[PDB]
Design a protein around this nucleic acid. Structure first.
Lengths: 333, 194
RNA sequence: ACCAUCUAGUACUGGUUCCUGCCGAAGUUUCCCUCAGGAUAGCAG
RNA sequence: AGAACUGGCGAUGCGGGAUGCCGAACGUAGAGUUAAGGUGCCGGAAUACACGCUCAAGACAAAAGGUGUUAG
RNA sequence: CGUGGAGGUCAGUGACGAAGCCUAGACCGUAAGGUCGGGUCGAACGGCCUCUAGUGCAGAUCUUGGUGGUAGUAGCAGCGAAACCACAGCCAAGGCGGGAAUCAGCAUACCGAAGCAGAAUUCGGUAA
RNA sequence: GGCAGCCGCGAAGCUACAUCCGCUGGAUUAUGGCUGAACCCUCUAAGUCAGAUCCAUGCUAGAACGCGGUGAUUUCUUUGCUCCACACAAUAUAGAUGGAUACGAAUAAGGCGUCCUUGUGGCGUCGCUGAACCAUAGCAGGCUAGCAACGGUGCACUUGGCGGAAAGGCCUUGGGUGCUUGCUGGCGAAUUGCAAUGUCAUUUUGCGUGGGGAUAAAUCAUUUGUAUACGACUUAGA
């Protein structure tokens, strides 16, 4: 057994705690250092191997790729940090004036029984000329060194019975922390898309809690060197609008995703599998730095995508395939 | 004597400084140590580093030996062995001791002190090698040296402006005294010693 | 094999009960073929 | 590996040597000086003075070498 | 000094409370112990000069009797033990010894040299 | 097929003979050089470049006897909670009895005042201990009179700046109000009997009023199924 991955004690929460960020680039424009989303099932994808010298070089090759259910990231605040001899410390936290019901639920377990006195008087302080809630920005500018944005996911968009919001801190790539806080404030209550941070062929890393076998499993894990193959937009239609297979369909498997994960929002395709099963929230990061190897730098296309259901063994790809061979079906037509 | 005494670890010796601090603590005197990251130990860097690394692996087995990295904690451990710890009297004595890297507030706005007999430069023979302790802490696992130096640099600033203001004030006071000289009160004071 | 008596037998373990003061050693020899025993040489009254 | 002998225990406190040879052999108490052993802290006592040494030690190996350091 | 009994004495104490028992209340004797005040007590005892002995307990894997953990454990939502029990235990070494409660286990390479052309080989050091 | 199962298809889970991935920066040593004495030379004595063992990056847990920020602070325990003003008690001190009375850097040199043809500069000079500096006079510190200045200072305000490392403090403008021992006078001190620390600091907590502020949250239940040996964890609902 691995010595580093011991003891095997289970994680304390579904969300995996991120404790490392890709340094701090003082020259890059302001951008998010990571992304948050939810994990769906898995599928299959094939692409052309442009890698030189490979056995399957310049040939179509099948690769296993998972699908991450990514809801839009709506900013709710930002957190500043200051260097100290006792380690990094969060000097001040601020919020985006207004908070959705899902965000308020995160602070409540018996939400229905509670009088729902969530963020309210704080908004009353904001409901004026600003003063303290505006001087906090100046205080952050004066002393802060690294600023982490505070965002939550649109859980109600995800097909999850649990409507409680999930929130985590994300560091800002850009320098000039004044610009960091200015951009964060301007983005208060705004919605951020995947294209604003990640991009196709980027070697992102995945971190999440492992599957529980029902103590084996249910522990946080980090997987690095995973290449994105296509930015997905499940809000629209015809997600399979690739250059090949001009018979546009949807990435959703027949009858919906197995067990759970009926995609109804943005999604992303990532090379290989991801730790943990569906219904688990997964955070994405740029993998610190980008390797210069062809396996990490080369860009890839996409073609065949499997759509047959897995509620059994799998056969039918689309409902329109059932005709001709079955003759008459008086029960239906 | 001042209720609390702040000792500057700059250019000092760990052994003698720890011994004197422990002796004062046993007598019932409150003492605080600042700029511990700049403390010095006799001998070259290799000798001191080996003497510390061997300690980390001597076993009691994690209940006993702890791979403590902070240089201030290393100094406390050095002073810990010079006090009758594990007892009410010794433990109470240690309660009057605090060690901080650099000079955090409010100790910045207060006069620090030095021990003449614990100065590394004074007691260490000239030309002989010595260890700065900071390098040892960095090599053994400490990683706050960069931040410590960065936030200590601001300590020299602002304090420099305060010193300049105090220098101007003392210049004015000296001018006032010089023009005040030759007065009858001044002459009487000079005659009567003062 | 058991039952009661001669038998409370046949010399090596265990234990050997209140207090204070004073004095206070030895561990070795003598005489019989030794370890079993005693004459005592010495120490202490 | 037996051995002819001279000081010491057995019945022996106490101070010192972290603990197992030195000092000193013992009524209950007050006062002052010491033995052994110590005067950087634990540990009650001078981080005392003076002459040189030593860069790794320092509280059975000495048969030999060092362009290690200081003297005739 | 003290306990059982006996000879002489205190023309001794005692239902207005002696023996016995408890005392975080006191006194005396450095000691075996003695005395006093207080809570129960209900019928006989104490000092002194002597005599007398089945006369003083922490041991005896002691005897008789009683009582704890074990334990509300095996056991038969039941009904209730036994074994064992001076007291210990988390280890660094020598004088043979530096924390709540329950649930789950019993090696490769890096340097210098060889008449090492290359391939390839050997040797002195680092290191497991 | 009610009862006890058998031939093709195939999950649901147990569960691998299934698939992907498994990182880049410092200081060293052995070793190869530079400068350069010991005494021409010398990789070493003062230093330094290249250069594998140690630490960093990363991952995993999180002091359950570590820490920061943040959503809200019982509308009747008869202001219930909270912060304040005054107001009486208990509680104790790891131990006030004038002041922690702020640069940096070197120890084979640094300041201070000045000059400036502004520098590693010139000039005069300071150390050799704080054995000092600020303050210190009044019934343990009162009343009051007069002189010189509007300086010093106890305290309630107000304009503004600095301090995020444990900033929680530093102040700054303007008046207001006491004292002023800077100087000169008038009042009382006794009896605690020749001394008995002769009681003056706050740490915490308890009870009595008035000046404001806000009025919530968690467990069970219900259940969920990513979790699931049993706990636990994850949820939905006035």
């Amino acid at each position: 057994g691995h010595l580093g991955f011991l003891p095997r004690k289970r994680a304390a929460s579904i969300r995996a705690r991120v404790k490392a960020f890709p340094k701090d680039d003082r020259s890059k424009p302001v951008a998010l250092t990571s992304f948050l989303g939810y994990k769906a099932g898995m599928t299959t994808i094939v692409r052309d191997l442009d890698r030189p010298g490979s056995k399957f070089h310049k040939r179509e090759v099948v690769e296993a790729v998972t699908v991450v259910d990514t809801p839009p990231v709506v900013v709710v605040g930002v957190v500043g940090y200051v260097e100290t001899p006792r380690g990094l410390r969060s000097l001040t936290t601020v919020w985006a004036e207004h908070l959705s019901d899902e965000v308020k639920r995160r602070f409540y377990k018996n939400w229905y029984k509670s009088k729902k006195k969530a963020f309210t008087k704080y908004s009353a302080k904001y409901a004026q000329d600003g003063a303290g809630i505006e001087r906090e920005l100046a205080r952050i500018k004066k002393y802060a060194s690294v600023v982490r944005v505070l965002v939550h996911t649109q859980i109600r968009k995800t097909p999850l019975a649990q409507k409680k919001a999930h929130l985590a801190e994300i560091q800002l790539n850009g320098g000039s922390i004044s610009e960091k806080v200015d951009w964060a404030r301007e983005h208060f209550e705004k919605t951020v898309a995947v294209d604003s941070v990640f991009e196709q062929n980027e070697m992102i890393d995945a971190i999440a809690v492992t599957k529980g076998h029902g103590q084996r499993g249910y522990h946080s894990r980090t997987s690095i060197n995973h290449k994105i193959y296509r930015v997905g937009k499940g809000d629209d239609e015809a997600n399979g609008a690739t250059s090949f297979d001009r018979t546009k369909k949807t990435i959703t498997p027949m009858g919906g995703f197995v067990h759970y994960g009926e995609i109804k929002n943005d999604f992303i395709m990532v090379k290989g599998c991801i730790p943990g099963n569906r219904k688990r929230i997964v955070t994405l990061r740029k993998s610190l730095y980008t390797n210069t190897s062809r396996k990490a730098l080369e860009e890839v296309s996409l073609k065949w995508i499997d759509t047959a259901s897995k509620f059994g063994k799998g056969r039918f790809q689309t409902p329109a395939e059932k005709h001709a061979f079955m003759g008459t079906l008086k029960k239906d037509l | 004597v001042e209720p609390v005494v702040v000792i500057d670890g700059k250019g000092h010796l760990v052994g003698r400084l720890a011994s004197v601090v422990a002796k004062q603590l046993l007598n019932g005197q409150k003492i605080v140590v600042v700029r511990a990251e700049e403390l010095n130990i006799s001998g070259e860097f290799f000798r001191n580093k080996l003497k510390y690394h061997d300690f980390l692996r001597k076993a009691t087995k994690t209940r006993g030996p702890f791979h403590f990295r902070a240089p201030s904690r290393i100094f406390y451990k050095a002073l810990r062995g010079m006090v009758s710890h594990k007892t009410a009297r010794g433990k109470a004595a240690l309660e009057r001791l605090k060690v901080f890297e650099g000079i955090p507030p409010p100790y910045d706005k207060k006069k620090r002190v030095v021990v003449p007999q614990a100065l590394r430069v004074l007691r260490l023979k000239p030309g002989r090698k010595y260890t700065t302790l900071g390098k040892l802490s960095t090599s053994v696992g400490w990683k706050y040296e960069d931040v410590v130096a960065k936030l200590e640099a601001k300590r020299k600033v602002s304090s420099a402006e305060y010193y300049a203001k105090k220098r101007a004030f003392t210049k004015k006071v000296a001018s006032a005294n010089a023009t005040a000289a030759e007065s009858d009160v001044a002459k009487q004071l000079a005659a009567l010693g003062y």
